[PDB]
RNA sequence: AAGG
RNA sequence: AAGGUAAGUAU
C-alpha cells in the first residue's frame, strides 16, 4: 500500500498516463488509510512485479489530487482505472459500471487476468474489453 | 429560433410556451412543419400562414404528430402578440380558422375576463369546419361548438387549457355582465 | 451588425432528388456529393430534417449577416396584411 | 461573495441544530473508546517498548 | 428587536414571480436559493400536520417562508385540547355515519383530482375569491350543549379566554365540570 | 367478525406491544429550535396564510 | 451538421 | 432503483 509509487498532483497523473506507450497504466484512486483501499493496494502490491512487463501501477490520493473527482466520478472509497496510450480502457465487469473497479479484490490472479485482458484489448485498439469473470454476484455459497 | 423572445413576459407565472405539455412541445419542435414554415414568424407571417390552415386539431397518429394549427398556436405562444393583435385575429370575419387560432390563443393566455369578453361574442358563428381527430381522421363541427369547448372543456386540441373562474362566480361579483344570447 | 431574423420566402426542395442515384468519386468535392448542401455555410447534410435544423441554426444565420431575434410586428402592418390577403383572393 | 455568505449561514445553522446532543454524545464517545482501548490497545502502543530499544 | 409580520400579498407576489428557473434575472444568486431547499421534508411534515379538520372551513396558519420563495414552512404545532378534540371527532363520527346512512349514492373523489400536466392552481385567482363550502358540523342543542356550544367547532377553542387557557401559547386548559360532562356526552361513540 | 378484521386487531395489538417494549426515555438535550433559528437569519420572513 |  | 452503456469515425 505504501511500497507503490504515488502521484501528488494532476499533472503527475497526466504525465504517468502519457509516459507509458506499451504498458497499461493502472491507477488506483482513493486513500491509503481506507480499509478497502488497503486491501486493493495489498493486492496490487502482490502483483506489481509480475505485471511489470505490460502494466505499471500508481496510487493517487483523491483528496491530495482532486482534479479527477468530477471527471471520473471518484466518489467511492476505492477505485481502480485502466489507461493505455492516453485512452481510458473501459472493462465490462458485469457490475453495471464499465469505467472502473470500485471495490476491492481478494485474488491476485483475478486482478492479473483483468490487467492482461485490458492490455490485449487495448493493444488490438479497443475501448471496451469483456472481463473474463462476471461480477453481477459475489459467488458466495 | 426555438426559445421565447426576450421582450415577452410570463403567462400564468410560467414561460408562455409552457402552456403546452413538454411531450407535445418536443414533438412540435421536431415536426417538419415547424422547422420549415415556422422558423421565423412575425404577426404578419403568422397571418399569412393562418389562412392556409385547412383544419383544427392537436396531434394525430400512433406517434405524436402535430397539426399545423397546433404549430401556429405554439409559435404565437413563443413570439407574444399584443392583445389588440389577438382581437384583430378574433375580429376577422372572412377566415374562420384565423379567428379560431386567435380565440385559442386568447383562451390560453388571456385573463378569465378576456375569455368571456372576446370569445363569447363568437357564439354567433356557426360555420362548418373540419377537425382532425387523434387517429388522423377528419370530422365536421362548427365554430360555436369550438367556442363552447374552449369555454367548458379542460382539454381542447390536445392542450390542457388554464383554469377559468366559472361564469356564475364571475356574474355574482358583478365585474362581468351576464351573457345575453341572441336566442 | 446582425440583422433581425426573417422568414424564408422560398420553399426548400427536400424531395427534389427522390429516387435519384448520384455517383461520387475521390475527386468529387462536397459541392456535388449526395445529400443536402449549403454554400452559405459550406456544409453537407444527408437528411431533410437535419438540413432544416441546419438552415434554422445560429451559425447559418450568422453567416448570412443575420440574428436569431425576430422583430415585433405592428398593428398597422398586420391589418394591411389582412387587407392585401383578402384582396388577393 | 454572497454565495459564500449564504453557504456559511446554512452551515452555521446546521451546526447549531447539532448542538442539542453534540457535547453529550461526544463525551460518551470519548468515554467509550477508552473503555474499549484498555481491553484492545492500539497496535503502535503494543510495540512502544520494543520501538524504544531501537 | 423582533421580526414584524409581512402582508400576505408579499409572499403571494414572490411565489407568483420567479416561478420558473429558466429566467436569468434572479440566477445571479442561487446558493441562498439552493441552500434552503434541503429542508423540503420539514415543510412537508409541518404542512401535513396542520391539515384542517372536517369541522373547519378555512384555517389561517402562521407561515415562515424563504426570502426568495424557495420554501415555505407552517410555523405552527397543532395543539388541541384532548377532551375537545375527542368530542369534536366523535361528533364528526356521528355526522359521517348519519350522512352515509342518509345519502343514497356517495360519489367518491377521483384520484388524482387534477391532470398530471395541469399546473397547480393560483390561489389568488381561484380560491381567494370563492366562498368555502359548508363544513361538517353536528347541530348542538342550545339547551344541553350550552356549556360548549359557543366555542365548539372553533380552531383552538377558548384560545383567547384567559379563564380556560393559560394564553395564546395554548398549553394548559382549566375546564368547568359542566363543559367536561357535555364533551363526555358528545364523545360517547 | 371476518378473519381479516381479527388479524387487523391482532396486528394492531402487536404494534402497540412492540412500541411499548421498545420505548426508551428521551435523551437529555439542549433545546435547539429549527424554525426559531430560521427566523434569526435574514433569509426567512413570517406571514399568515 | 443542431440543440442549453 | 440497479446488476441491460458496444468502442468508434464522420456530419
UniProtKB/Swiss-Prot annotation, chain A:
GO cellular component: cytosol; nucleoplasm; nucleus; spliceosomal complex; U2-type precatalytic spliceosome; U4/U6 x U5 tri-snRNP complex; U5 snRNP
Gene Ontology biological-process annotations: cell division; mRNA splicing, via spliceosome; RNA splicing, via transesterification reactions; spliceosomal complex assembly
Oligomeric form and interacting partners: Component of the precatalytic spliceosome (spliceosome B complex). Component of the U5 snRNP complex. Component of the U4/U6-U5 tri-snRNP complex. The U4/U6-U5 tri-snRNP complex is a building block of the precatalytic spliceosome (spliceosome B complex). The U4/U6-U5 tri-snRNP complex is composed of the U4, U6 and U5 snRNAs and at least PRPF3, PRPF4, PRPF6, PRPF8, PRPF31, SNRNP200, TXNL4A, SNRNP40, SNRPB, SNRPD1, SNRPD2, SNRPD3, SNRPE, SNRPF, SNRPG, DDX23, CD2BP2, PPIH, SNU13, EFTUD2, SART1 and USP39, plus LSM2, LSM3, LSM4, LSM5, LSM6, LSM7 and LSM8. Directly interacts with CD2BP2.
Modification comment: The disulfide bond seen in structures determined by X-ray crystallography and NMR is not essential for protein folding and function.
Natural source organism: Homo sapiens
Disulphide bridges: 37-78
Family: Belongs to the DIM1 family.
Subcellular location, record wording: Nucleus
Superkingdom of the source species: Eukaryota
Protein's recorded name: Thioredoxin-like protein 4A
Entry keyword set: Cell cycle, Cell division, Deafness, Disulfide bond, Mitosis, mRNA processing, mRNA splicing, Nucleus, Phosphoprotein, Spliceosome
Residues annotated with Phosphoserine modification: 131
Swiss-Prot record, chain B:
GO biological process, one term: mRNA splicing, via spliceosome
GO cellular component: nucleoplasm; nucleus; precatalytic spliceosome; U2-type precatalytic spliceosome
Compartments, record wording: Nucleus
UniProt KW Coiled coil keyword: yes
One GO MF term: RNA binding
Chain spans, region N-terminal protein interaction domain: 1-178
Function, in words: Involved in pre-mRNA splicing as a component of the spliceosome.
Family membership: Belongs to the PRP38 family.
Subunit and partners: Component of the spliceosome B complex. Interacts (via N-terminal interaction domain) with ZMAT2 and MFAP1.
The protein's name in its UniProt record: Pre-mRNA-splicing factor 38A
Organism: Homo sapiens (Human)
Residues of the full protein shown: 2 to 184 of 312
UniProtKB/Swiss-Prot annotation, chain D:
Modified positions (Phosphoserine) in chain numbering: 48
First-to-last residue of the parent protein present: 96 to 149 of 941
Biological role: Involved in pre-mRNA splicing as component of the U4/U6-U5 tri-snRNP complex, one of the building blocks of the spliceosome. Enhances dihydrotestosterone-induced transactivation activity of AR, as well as dexamethasone-induced transactivation activity of NR3C1, but does not affect estrogen-induced transactivation.
Record protein name field: Pre-mRNA-processing factor 6
Annotated S-S bridges: none
Tissue specificity annotation: Widely expressed.
Subunit and partners: Identified in the spliceosome B complex. Identified in the spliceosome C complex. Associates with the U5 snRNP particle. Component of the U4/U6-U5 tri-snRNP complex composed of the U4, U6 and U5 snRNAs and at least PRPF3, PRPF4, PRPF6, PRPF8, PRPF31, SNRNP200, TXNL4A, SNRNP40, DDX23, CD2BP2, PPIH, SNU13, EFTUD2, SART1 and USP39, LSm proteins LSm2-8 and Sm proteins. Interacts with ARAF. Interacts with AR and NR3C1, but not ESR1, independently of the presence of hormones. Interacts with USH1G.
Subcellular location: Nucleus, Nucleoplasm; Nucleus speckle
Lineage start: Eukaryota, Metazoa, Chordata, Craniata, Vertebrata
Post-translational modification: Phosphorylated by PRP4K during spliceosome assembly.
From Swiss-Prot, chain E:
Annotated compartments: Nucleus; Nucleus speckle
Residues annotated as signal peptide: none
Entry comment describing in which tissues the protein is expressed: Widely expressed.
Description of its domains: The MPN (JAB/Mov34) domain mediates interaction with TSSC4 and SNRNP200. Has structural similarity with deubiquitinating enzymes, but lacks the residues that would bind the catalytic metal ion. Contains a region with structural similarity to reverse transcriptase, presenting the classical thumb, fingers and palm architecture, but lacks enzyme activity, since the essential metal-binding residues are not conserved.
Record's subunit section: Part of the U5 snRNP complex. Component of the U4/U6-U5 tri-snRNP complex composed of the U4, U6 and U5 snRNAs and at least PRPF3, PRPF4, PRPF6, PRPF8, PRPF31, SNRNP200, TXNL4A, SNRNP40, DDX23, CD2BP2, PPIH, SNU13, EFTUD2, SART1 and USP39. Component of the U5.U4atac/U6atac snRNP complexes in U12-dependent spliceosomes. Within the minor spliceosome, which acts on U12-type introns, interacts with PPIL2 and RBM48. Core component of U2-type precatalytic, catalytic and postcatalytic spliceosomal complexes. Found in a mRNA splicing-dependent exon junction complex (EJC) with SRRM1.
Protein name per its UniProtKB record: Pre-mRNA-processing-splicing factor 8
Native source organism of the sequence: Homo sapiens (Human)
Top-level taxonomy: Eukaryota, Metazoa, Chordata, Craniata, Vertebrata
Amino acid at each position: 500500500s505504501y511500497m507503490l509509487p504515488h502521484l501528488h498532483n494532476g499533472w503527475q497523473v497526466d504525465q504517468a498516463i502519457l509516459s507509458e506507450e506499451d504498458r497499461v497504466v493502472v491507477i488506483r484512486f482513493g486513500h491509503d488509510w481506507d480499509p478497502t483501499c488497503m486491501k486493493m493496494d495489498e493486492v496490487l502490491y502482490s502483483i506489481a512485479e509480475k505485471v511489470k512487463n505490460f502494466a505499471v501501477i500508481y496510487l493517487v490520493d483523491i483528496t491530495e489530487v482532486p482534479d479527477f473527482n468530477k471527471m471520473y466520478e471518484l466518489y467511492d472509497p476505492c477505485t481502480v482505472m485502466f489507461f493505455f496510450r492516453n485512452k481510458h480502457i473501459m472493462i465490462d465487469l458485469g457490475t453495471g459500471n464499465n469505467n472502473k473497479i470500485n471495490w476491492a479484490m481478494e485474488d491476485k490472479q483475478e486482478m492479473v487476468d483483468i490487467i492482461e485482458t485490458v492490455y490485449r484489448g487495448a493493444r488490438k485498439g479497443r475501448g471496451l474489453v469483456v472481463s473474463p469473470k462476471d461480477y453481477s454476484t459475489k459467488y458466495r455459497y | 429560433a426555438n426559445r421565447t423572445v426576450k421582450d415577452a413576459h410570463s403567462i400564468h407565472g410560467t414561460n408562455p410556451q409552457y402552456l403546452v405539455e413538454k411531450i407535445i412541445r418536443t414533438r412540435i419542435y421536431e415536426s417538419k412543419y415547424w422547422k420549415e414554415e415556422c422558423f421565423g414568424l412575425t404577426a404578419e407571417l403568422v397571418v399569412d400562414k393562418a389562412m392556409e390552415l385547412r383544419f383544427v386539431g392537436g396531434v394525430y397518429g400512433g406517434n405524436i404528430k402535430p397539426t399545423p394549427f397546433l404549430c401556429l398556436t405554439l409559435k404565437m405562444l413563443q413570439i407574444q402578440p399584443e392583445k389588440d393583435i389577438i382581437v384583430e385575429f378574433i375580429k376577422n370575419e372572412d377566415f374562420k380558422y384565423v379567428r379560431m387560432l386567435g380565440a385559442l390563443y386568447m383562451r390560453l393566455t388571456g385573463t378569465a375576463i378576456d375569455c368571456y369578453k372576446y370569445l363569447e361574442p363568437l357564439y354567433n358563428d356557426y360555420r362548418k369546419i373540419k377537425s382532425q381527430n387523434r387517429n388522423g381522421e377528419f370530422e365536421l363541427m362548427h365554430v360555436d361548438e369550438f367556442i363552447d369547448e374552449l369555454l367548458h372543456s379542460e382539454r381542447v386540441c390536445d392542450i390542457i387549457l388554464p383554469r377559468l373562474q366559472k361564469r356564475y362566480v364571475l356574474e355574482e361579483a358583478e365585474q362581468l355582465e351576464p351573457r345575453v344570447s341572441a336566442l | 451588425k446582425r440583422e433581425l431574423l426573417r422568414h424564408r420566402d422560398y420553399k426548400v426542395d427536400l424531395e427534389s432528388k427522390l429516387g435519384k442515384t448520384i455517383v461520387i468519386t475521390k475527386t468529387t468535392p462536397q459541392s456535388e456529393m449526395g445529400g443536402y448542401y449549403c454554400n452559405v455555410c459550406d456544409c453537407v447534410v444527408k437528411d431533410s430534417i437535419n438540413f432544416l435544423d441546419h438552415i434554422n441554426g445560429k451559425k447559418h444565420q450568422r453567416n448570412l449577416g443575420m440574428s436569431m431575434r425576430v422583430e415585433r410586428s405592428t398593428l398597422d402592418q398586420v391589418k394591411k396584411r389582412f387587407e392585401v390577403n383578402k384582396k388577393k383572393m | 461573495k454572497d454565495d459564500e455568505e449564504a453557504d456559511a449561514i446554512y452551515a452555521a445553522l446546521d451546526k447549531r441544530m447539532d448542538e442539542r446532543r453534540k457535547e453529550r454524545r461526544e463525551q460518551r464517545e470519548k468515554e467509550e473508546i477508552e473503555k474499549y482501548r484498555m481491553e484492545r490497545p492500539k497496535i503502535q502502543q503494543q510495540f512502544s517498548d520494543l520501538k524504544r530499544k531501537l | 428587536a423582533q421580526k414584524e409580520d409581512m402582508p400576505p400579498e408579499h409572499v403571494r407576489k414572490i411565489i407568483r414571480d420567479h416561478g420558473d428557473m429558466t429566467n436569468r434575472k434572479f440566477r445571479h444568486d442561487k446558493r441562498v436559493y439552493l441552500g434552503a431547499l434541503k429542508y423540503m421534508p420539514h415543510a412537508v411534515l409541518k404542512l401535513l400536520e396542520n391539515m384542517p379538520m372536517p369541522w373547519e372551513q378555512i384555517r389561517d396558519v402562521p407561515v415562515l417562508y424563504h426570502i426568495t420563495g424557495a420554501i415555505s414552512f407552517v410555523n405552527e404545532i397543532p395543539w388541541v385540547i384532548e377532551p375537545v378534540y375527542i368530542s369534536q371527532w366523535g361528533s364528526m363520527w356521528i355526522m359521517m355515519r348519519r350522512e352515509k346512512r342518509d345519502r343514497r349514492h356517495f360519489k367518491r373523489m377521483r384520484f388524482p383530482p387534477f391532470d398530471d400536466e395541469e399546473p397547480p392552481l393560483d390561489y389568488a385567482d381561484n380560491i381567494l375569491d370563492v366562498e368555502p363550502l359548508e363544513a361538517i358540523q353536528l347541530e348542538l342543542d342550545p339547551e344541553e350543549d350550552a356549556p360548549v356550544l359557543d366555542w365548539f367547532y372553533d380552531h383552538q377553542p377558548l384560545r383567547d379566554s384567559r379563564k380556560y387557557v393559560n394564553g395564546s401559547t395554548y398549553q394548559r386548559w382549566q375546564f368547568t365540570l359542566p363543559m367536561m360532562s357535555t364533551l363526555y356526552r358528545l364523545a360517547n361513540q | 367478525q371476518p378473519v381479516k378484521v381479527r388479524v387487523s386487531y391482532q396486528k394492531l395489538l402487536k404494534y402497540y406491544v412492540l412500541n411499548a417494549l421498545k420505548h426508551r426515555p428521551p435523551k437529555a438535550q439542549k433545546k435547539r429550535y429549527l424554525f426559531r433559528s430560521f427566523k434569526a437569519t435574514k433569509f426567512f420572513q413570517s406571514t399568515k396564510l
